[PDB]
Ligand binder design. Structure first.
Ligand SMILES: COc1ccc(CC[C@H]2OC(=O)[C@@H]3CCCCN3C(=O)[C@@H](C3CCCCC3)c3cc(OC)c(c(OC)c3)OCCOc3cccc2c3)cc1OC
Length: 126
């Protein structure tokens, strides 16, 4: 799955340095995508592509909530979720420069960590 994005994934970085690659796995409704400051509701699965940690919001039987484009998540999420429609599910492969960089985030993330996410956008509100 990490390797499929590497092949077919769209580069959605401004720089166009392939730091955030994205495939749509399920198409959402309408055309509308969230705006900066929108409250965003998602389920996700994430892992360290070359690593031994796996996290899912489904574990905690409730959606992950955050405010879009306000630094509250890694760069990739602010860039990635911004491009998603209500009910869309997308896959993201993310180089470390758009995640936790060379520092990582001991304990859960190491240095130079490449991240993969499956994200489902449930809802967003202004
Ligand atoms: C510039 O450096 C940073 C940029 C952003 C952040 C905020 C971390 C943020 O988490 C995330 O952005 C992403 C996507 C949003 C949900 C969870 N996230 C994760 O990366 C997970 C990882 C993803 C798979 C590997 C192991 C768990 C992930 C899950 C985690 O457990 C729920 C987790 C975590 O902490 C680093 C990452 O630790 C608990 C914190 O939960 C939150 C809550 C709000 C936002 C996030 C996590 C910290 C930074 O430095 C440390």
């Amino acid at each position: 799955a990490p390797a499929t994005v590497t092949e077919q994934g769209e580069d959605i970085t401004s720089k166009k340095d392939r730091g955030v690659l994205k495939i749509v796995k399920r198409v959402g409704n309408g055309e509308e995508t969230p705006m900066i400051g929108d409250k965003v509701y998602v389920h996700y699965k994430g892992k360290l592509s070359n690593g031994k940690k796996f996290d899912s919001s489904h574990d905690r039987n409730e959606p992950f909530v955050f405010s879009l484009g306000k630094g509250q998540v890694i760069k990739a999420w602010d860039i990635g979720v911004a491009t998603m429609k209500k009910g869309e599910i997308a896959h993201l492969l993310i180089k470390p420069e758009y995640a936790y960089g060379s520092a990582g985030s001991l304990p859960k993330i190491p240095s130079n960590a490449t991240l993969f996410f499956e994200i489902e956008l449930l809802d967003f509100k202004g």
